UniProtKB/Swiss-Prot annotation, chain A:
Subunit structure: Component of the RNA polymerase I (Pol I) complex consisting of 13 subunits: a ten-subunit catalytic core composed of POLR1A/RPA1, POLR1B/RPA2, POLR1C/RPAC1, POLR1D/RPAC2, POLR1H/RPA12, POLR2E/RPABC1, POLR2F/RPABC2, POLR2H/RPABC3, POLR2K/RPABC4 and POLR2L/RPABC5; a mobile stalk subunit POLR1F/RPA43 protruding from the core and additional subunits homologous to general transcription factors POLR1E/RPA49 and POLR1G/RPA34. Part of Pol I pre-initiation complex (PIC), in which Pol I core assembles with RRN3 and promoter-bound UTBF and SL1/TIF-IB complex.
Name assigned to this protein: DNA-directed RNA polymerase I subunit RPA1
Annotated disease: Acrofacial dysostosis, Cincinnati type: A form of acrofacial dysostosis, a group of disorders characterized by malformations of the craniofacial skeleton and, in some patients, the limbs. AFDCIN patients may also have structural cardiac defects and neurologic abnormalities including developmental delay, hypotonia, motor delay and seizures. AFDCIN inheritance is autosomal dominant. Leukodystrophy, hypomyelinating, 27: A form of hypomyelinating leukodystrophy, a group of heterogeneous disorders characterized by persistent deficit of myelin observed on brain imaging. HLD27 is an autosomal recessive form characterized by global developmental delay apparent from infancy, poor or absent speech, ataxic gait or inability to sit or walk, spasticity, and abnormal eye movements. Some patients have seizures. Brain imaging shows hypomyelinating leukodystrophy, cerebellar atrophy, and thin corpus callosum.
Gene (name only): POLR1A
Cell compartment(s), UniProt: Nucleus, Nucleolus; Chromosome
Family designation: Belongs to the RNA polymerase beta' chain family.
Signal sequence, renumbered to the chain: none
Organism this protein belongs to: Homo sapiens
Residue segments, region Clamp: 1-79
Residue range from the parent sequence: 116 to 227 of 1720
Annotated binding of Zn(2+) 2, by residue: 83, 86
Curated annotation (Swiss-Prot), chain B:
Cross-link Glycyl lysine isopeptide (Lys-Gly) (interchain with G-Cter in SUMO2) placement: 70
Keyword Isomerase part of the UniProt annotation: no
NCBIfam families assigned: PRK09570.1 (NF007129)
Record gene name: POLR2E
Gene Ontology annotations of biological process type: protein stabilization; transcription by RNA polymerase II; transcription elongation by RNA polymerase I; tRNA transcription by RNA polymerase III
Protein name: DNA-directed RNA polymerases I, II, and III subunit RPABC1
Native source species: Homo sapiens
Main location: nucleus
Swiss-Prot record, chain C:
Name of the gene: POLR2F
Subcellular locations according to the entry: Nucleus; Nucleus, Nucleolus
Main location: nucleus
Organism encoding this protein: Homo sapiens
Complete-protein stretch covered: 51 to 126 of 127
Full protein name: DNA-directed RNA polymerases I, II, and III subunit RPABC2
UniProt keyword annotation of Phosphoprotein present: yes
Job of this protein: DNA-dependent RNA polymerase catalyzes the transcription of DNA into RNA using the four ribonucleoside triphosphates as substrates. Common component of RNA polymerases I, II, and III which synthesize ribosomal RNA precursors, mRNA precursors and many functional non-coding RNAs, and small RNAs, such as 5S rRNA and tRNAs, respectively. Pol II is the central component of the basal RNA polymerase II transcription machinery. Pols are composed of mobile elements that move relative to each other.
Molecular function via GO: DNA binding; DNA-directed RNA polymerase activity
Gene Ontology cellular component annotations, sorted alphabetically: cytosol; fibrillar center; nucleoplasm; nucleus; RNA polymerase I complex; RNA polymerase II, core complex; RNA polymerase III complex
RNA sequence: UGCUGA
DNA sequence: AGGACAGCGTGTCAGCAATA
DNA sequence: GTACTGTCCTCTGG
């Protein structure tokens, strides 16, 4: 998810809007370096062949896509989870009313 | 014998869907009545059709009518094998209750090697394209979209959008990134023409 | 070269306004005014005679522009 | 906050 | 994943007294 | 006022 979203943002910054679903499907059809090299080749090819479009990216249909992507990220992938590398890395931050964040043992 | 009425309606709708995509279909198939459908053909494996394309005679399509009311990954593989061996690329799977949810992402997983697509049976009982309010859609060719963008000084984004799951984008089998011309019959101007990028 | 040949009403309004703001700032009047103290009446007198050396720069929605002459524009 | 005018 | 729910929202138009 | 988004909230799937 991290690398997919990174590449989708890299392509959105220049306006390429088909690259979004193309990257997602390239991913689904496919280690961590392995995923990065699979996606970064296509993303760099897009950002290079489709530059000159940083001025033509501030249009509706390019802002809706970025909005939706970042909103879905913040909404679905930032929940407390058991940690990948060490299975016991949930030092549960759990914030009370504003001005209060409490980590546990 | 209502199963036969449903089979006949679905077969007529699929013949119309295949003709609207530009496949070689005869007038009799498009004007076939029930009495002669049941005369010819009972089963759900001899309703499978294989159609050819106007151009690219190798480019043909294959319509399936699975028996399982809820098709699964194994059912999909069993005739993805048929397609891979008969040397076809496209398919069309008419399902009676739905596809188990893992199957939908499998059909998507099969790369342009073997591109499939599903249709519910209740979605084919009538041709939505023949509704009063539904305009005529026309998949533009790669050389007409360029002239459009050049005439209006547009970009491909910055054009109205049509969803890739739109009931009339799924029917005309339009992939993503394709522009479709739409001829709205307007009470004001007669035959207004619009364009929508499929995404 | 592809836009309409006529002068839209918004263009007439802005051209009259600009010519009037110029006349009022002591600009030479090429129309032989005949005792009128309004710069807008003088600007209309000039527009009717086809003496306004201004270039309407019509902008298209992608940045591309087309430069028309106020003389080469059909005033309705 | 209590009033008032379209 | 079926929910339960807590969470933001706006609201035509100008005057006067009077008082925070 | 109601209806929307949102917000998880954590319950059966590999």
């Amino acid at each position: 998810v991290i690398h997919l979203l990174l590449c989708q943002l890299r392509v959105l910054e220049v306006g390429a809007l088909q690259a979004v679903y193309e990257l997602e499907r390239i991913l689904n059809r496919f280690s961590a370096s392995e995923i990065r090299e699979e996606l970064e080749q296509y993303t760099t090819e897009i950002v290079q062949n489709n530059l000159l479009g940083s001025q033509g990216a501030h249009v509706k249909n390019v802002c809706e896509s970025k909005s939706k992507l970042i909103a879905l990220f913040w909404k679905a992938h930032m929940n407390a989870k058991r940690c990948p590398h060490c299975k016991t890395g949930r030092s549960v931050v759990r914030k009370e009313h504003n001005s209060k964040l409490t980590i546990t043992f | 014998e209502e199963e036969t009425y449903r089979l006949w309606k679905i077969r007529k709708t699929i013949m119309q869907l295949c003709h609207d995509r530009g496949y070689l279909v005869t007038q009799d198939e498009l004007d076939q009545t029930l009495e002669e459908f049941k005369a010819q053909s009972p089963r759900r494996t001899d309703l499978t059709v294989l159609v050819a394309h106007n151009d690219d005679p190798t480019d043909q399509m294959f319509v399936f009518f699975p028996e399982e009311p809820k098709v699964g990954i194994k059912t999909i593989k069993v005739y993805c094998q048929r397609m891979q061996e008969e040397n076809i690329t496209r398919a069309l799977i008419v399902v009676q209750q739905g596809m188990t949810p893992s199957a939908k992402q499998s059909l998507v997983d099969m790369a342009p090697k073997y591109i499939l697509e599903q249709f519910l049976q209740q979605e084919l009982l009538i041709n939505i394209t023949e509704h009063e309010l539904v305009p005529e859609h026309v998949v533009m060719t790669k050389e007409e979209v360029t002239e459009l963008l050049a005439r209006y000084k547009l970009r491909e984004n910055q054009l109205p959008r049509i969803q890739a799951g739109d009931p009339v984008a799924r029917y005309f089998g339009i992939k993503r990134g394709q522009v479709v011309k739409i001829i709205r019959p307007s009470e004001t101007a007669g035959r207004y023409i619009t364009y929508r990028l499929v995404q | 070269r592809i836009t309409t040949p006529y002068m839209t009403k918004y263009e007439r309004a802005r051209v009259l306004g600009t010519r009037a703001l110029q006349i009022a700032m002591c600009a030479p009047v090429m129309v032989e005014l005949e005792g009128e103290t309004d710069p807008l009446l003088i600007a209309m007198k000039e527009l009717k005679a086809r003496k306004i050396p201004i270039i309407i720069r019509r902008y298209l929605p992608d940045g591309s522009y087309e430069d028309w002459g106020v003389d080469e524009l059909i005033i309705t």
